[PDB]
Amino acid sequence: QGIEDPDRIERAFNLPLYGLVPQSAEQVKLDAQAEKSGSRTRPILASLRPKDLSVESLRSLRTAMQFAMMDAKNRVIVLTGPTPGIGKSFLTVNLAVLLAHSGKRVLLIDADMRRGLLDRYFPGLSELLSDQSALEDAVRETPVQGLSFISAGTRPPNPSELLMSTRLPQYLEGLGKRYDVVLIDSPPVLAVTDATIIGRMAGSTFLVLRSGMHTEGEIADAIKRLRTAGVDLEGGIFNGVP
Amino acid sequence: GIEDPDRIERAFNLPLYGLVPQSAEQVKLDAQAEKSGSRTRPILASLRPKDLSVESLRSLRTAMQFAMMDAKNRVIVLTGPTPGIGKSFLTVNLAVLLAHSGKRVLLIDADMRRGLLDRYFPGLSELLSDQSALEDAVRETPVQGLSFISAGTRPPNPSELLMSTRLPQYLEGLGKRYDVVLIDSPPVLAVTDATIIGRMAGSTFLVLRSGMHTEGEIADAIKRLRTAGVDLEGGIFNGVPP
Numbered sequence A: 001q002g003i004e005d006p007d008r009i010e011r012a013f014n015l016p017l018y019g020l021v022p023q024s025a026e027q028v029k030l031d032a033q034a035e036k037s038g039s040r041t042r043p044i045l046a047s048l049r050p051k052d053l054s055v056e057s058l059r060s061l062r063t064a065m066q067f068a069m070m071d072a073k074n075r076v077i078v079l080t081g082p083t084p085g086i087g088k089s090f091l092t093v094n095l096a097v098l099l100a101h102s103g104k105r106v107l108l109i110d111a112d113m114r115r116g117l118l119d120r121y122f123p124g125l126s127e128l129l130s131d132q133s134a135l136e137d138a139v140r141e142t143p144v145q146g147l148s149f150i151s152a153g154t155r156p157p158n159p160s161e162l163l164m165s166t167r168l169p170q171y172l173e174g175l176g177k178r179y180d181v182v183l184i185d186s187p188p189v190l191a192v193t194d195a196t197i198i199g200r201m202a203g204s205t206f207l208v209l210r211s212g213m214h215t216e217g218e219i220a221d222a223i224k225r226l227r228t229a230g231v232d233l234e235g236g237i238f239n240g241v242p
Numbered sequence B: 001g002i003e004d005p006d007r008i009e010r011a012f013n014l015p016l017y018g019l020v021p022q023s024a025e026q027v028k029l030d031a032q033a034e035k036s037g038s039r040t041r042p043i044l045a046s047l048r049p050k051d052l053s054v055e056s057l058r059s060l061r062t063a064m065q066f067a068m069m070d071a072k073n074r075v076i077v078l079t080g081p082t083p084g085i086g087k088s089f090l091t092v093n094l095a096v097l098l099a100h101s102g103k104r105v106l107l108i109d110a111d112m113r114r115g116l117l118d119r120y121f122p123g124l125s126e127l128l129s130d131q132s133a134l135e136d137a138v139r140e141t142p143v144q145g146l147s148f149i150s151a152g153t154r155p156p157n158p159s160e161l162l163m164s165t166r167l168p169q170y171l172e173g174l175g176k177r178y179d180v181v182l183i184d185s186p187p188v189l190a191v192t193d194a195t196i197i198g199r200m201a202g203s204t205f206l207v208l209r210s211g212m213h214t215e216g217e218i219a220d221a222i223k224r225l226r227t228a229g230v231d232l233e234g235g236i237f238n239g240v241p242p
């Protein structure tokens, strides 16, 4: 039975929810006519519709996430989730733009090197972590003023092994000083190794969950992996509220 | 993760239909494919007929054939707990060896989020979104007696497409025109994935890679499948020490 009750989530797992993001009918429309026109560019709700209820809900979520990051003395924020299809791309990109709009210098990173498609909203991480590219080539300017971006890059055959290396942590330390926040869209926590990976990013970590998509045991499994790996799991983000 | 195959059959009453060694030649061929700016994956069963892994797969091929005719079903499904287990490698090599045994085989890449099987040679996504007819989606490969449906272009709604009425209707017809329909299904990450695999209505096998899975991760995958009503015949233990 898919979980839709946010109160049930907070009490069952001691997971404070940093935001309730409604299912945007305007986002569904934008998605529909981009998939109809054969668009290779996903729209950014935050840039196109500043008054949308999901966007106002995202503005709230952003301030709360900033405070959490500052309390934890971090410069990296990590979004994860139990599975794909939960709105982790939508959230990470809209959050990055709102942080950039607030006045912050933001670095967005697509760390899902098996299915990351954050480039669609605008070499990448796979090359940088393979030493096929230097940092100054991987870091790209975005249409959005103040937002810089590192795509997932060419799909590698060893994405897990690349994220387990010394290089990612060491790049993140420098990038955390050159940018106000480093926002990472990480791969979903399917297994122990996924949790270890997210631990190495060492940022304020938020578990994305979509309404009606997860069973109680499914949420429990993701939380237990993150928590047993020693990840800084600040709280959750509940997405697609009807 | 778990290395001992005896612990797997004992702990989950999951009889292993095959033990497939880590093939050193496959490792070499992947390295060689990687370094060369190549857009194709080498089929081991084609290139190395007496590779120990290919030899273990002919044993597996026969066991699955007995399974599917006892079940009076010409749909075979492979699933797994996560990516990186060798499900692509096993399905394509099992498809080729079944063709070599003199069967008309249809291989379907149902994993529409990654869709890699076409690298070994319109697809499923265009078929289930009514953009293509079955006639245009089914392709004849360079392997004689082997036909193939690719993943197709990555859709925004993969689970929605696999949960549509079209999938089982198409499989009903294709099962009458081929001796074997072999499906590379998405991994069983949640009950929704187990339902989709249940609608495929085939003799189903759980792929597990040596040293990758905890006892809990294996248990979750099996539980999702058994509770969704899936005909889980047994498992395939891949990457064992040669």
Ligand SMILES: Nc1ncnc2c1ncn2[C@@H]1O[C@H](COP(=O)(O)OP(=O)(O)O)[C@@H](O)[C@H]1O
Pocket (backbone or CB within 6 Å): A021, A022, A023, A024, A025, A027, A028, A031, A054, A081, A083, A084, A085, A086, A087, A088, A089, A090, A091, A239, A240, A241, B156
């Ligand atoms: N709150 C929402 N309102 C409307 N559409 C949404 C919402 N959240 C996600 N979506 C849509 O659902 C789909 C899946 O979201 P996405 O971020 O791509 O998933 P993933 O978690 O795999 O990154 C996309 O088409 C996205 O635009």
Ligand SMILES: Nc1ncnc2c1ncn2[C@@H]1O[C@H](COP(=O)(O)OP(=O)(O)O)[C@@H](O)[C@H]1O
Pocket (backbone or CB within 6 Å): A157, B020, B021, B022, B023, B024, B026, B027, B030, B053, B080, B082, B083, B084, B085, B086, B087, B088, B089, B090, B238, B239, B240
């Ligand atoms: N038994 C094996 N011996 C050697 N290499 C293997 C074996 N099984 C899989 N591989 C390799 O491991 C990688 C991952 O396997 P693949 O089938 O692509 O994973 P997935 O489960 O995500 O489909 C590939 O490069 C594949 O060729």
